[PDB]
Amino acid sequence: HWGYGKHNGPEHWHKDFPIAKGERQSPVDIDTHTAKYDPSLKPLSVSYDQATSLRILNNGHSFQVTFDDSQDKAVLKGGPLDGTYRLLQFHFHWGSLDGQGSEHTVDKKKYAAELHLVHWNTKYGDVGKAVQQPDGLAVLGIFLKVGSAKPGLQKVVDVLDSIKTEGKSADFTNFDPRGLLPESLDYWTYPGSLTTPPLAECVTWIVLKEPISVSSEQVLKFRKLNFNGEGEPEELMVDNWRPAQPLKNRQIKASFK
Ligand SMILES: NS(=O)(=O)c1ccc(NC(=O)Nc2ccc(F)cc2)cc1
Numbered sequence: 723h724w725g726y727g728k729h730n731g732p733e734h735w736h737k738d739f740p741i742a743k744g745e746r747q748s749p750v751d752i753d754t755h756t757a758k759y760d761p762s763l764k765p766l767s768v769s770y771d772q773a774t775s776l777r778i779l780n781n782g783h784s785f786q787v788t789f790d791d792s793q794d795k796a797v798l799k800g801g802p803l804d805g806t807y808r809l810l811q812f813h814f815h816w817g818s819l820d821g822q823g824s825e826h827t828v829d830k831k832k833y834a835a836e837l838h839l840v841h842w843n844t845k846y847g848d849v850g851k852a853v854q855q856p857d858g859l860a861v862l863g864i865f866l867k868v869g870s871a872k873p874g875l876q877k878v879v880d881v882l883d884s885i886k887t888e889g890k891s892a893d894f895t896n897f898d899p900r901g902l903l904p905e906s907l908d909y910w911t912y913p914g915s916l917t918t919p920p921l922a923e924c925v926t927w928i929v930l931k932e933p934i935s936v937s938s939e940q941v942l943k944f945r946k947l948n949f950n951g952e953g954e955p956e957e958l959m960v961d962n963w964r965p966a967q968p969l970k971n972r973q974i975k976a977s978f979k
Pocket residue numbers: 838840849850853861915916917918919920
């Protein structure tokens with residue numbers, strides 16, 4: 723099926739998911755001097771104090787930390803959003819080299835990785851229903867640059883050895899995702915899509931201005947994961963990012979000046 727290689731990568735996805743060429747595809751380049759400050763945008767409300775992490779898992783295209791989304795526990799609200807969105811999972815996209823790896827870009831600049839905190843609109847009842855709606859998901863995107871270590875990321879780094887290959891998972895309870903956030907919650911926002919198949923056009927994107935810094939040792943451990951399953955020819959899980967897509971008839975709004 724689909725992946726990030728030369729014969730199944732982003733240039734191939736449209737054949738099984740024709741919405742790949744749709745009108746609100748993600749990621750995009752954020753042109754900072756074309757994004758307009760919108761003074762009617764509210765501050766984001768990130769309420770993660772009650773977050774309950776469950777598992778960490780290699781799904782053959784990234785690794786994901788999953789949360790209990792059966793109650794309002796870890797929710798995103800405010801910003802451009804109406805209503806309440808529950809945190810379901812987070813995952814990353816990263817490169818083979820530090821100059822590439824993010825999905826969104828900023829004035830064509832690529833960061834070393836990008837964190838996606840995936841939330842779904844509780845008015846649709848379950849995530850499967852939400853992905854069929856134009857306002858079903860809100861993904862909070864955070865850029866990673868290589869510099870100083872991110873202490874809140876180390877517990878994730880520590881366990882990646884135990885989920886090296888596709889299909890492996892581990893208990894990952896009591897993880898606090900607040901340790902992955904930068905200081906500022908200033909943000910760009912636009913309407914877009916999932917960046918992996920099925921590429922559904924169901925996402926309000928909220929991309930934070932301020933990257934987090936992670937150490938070279940931390941991102942190196944990302945690069946030691948495998949796309950393949952156990953026992954099969956080792957292909958390093960690197961460059962699992964979709965490139966920027968046409969902005970088409972969309973405006974990116976900034977919450978800052
Ligand atoms: N890389 S991204 O845009 O943040 C993203 C987030 C979520 C998905 N996929 C997803 O959530 N699928 C899903 C559908 C129904 C379910 F019940 C659960 C998951 C794909 C890309």
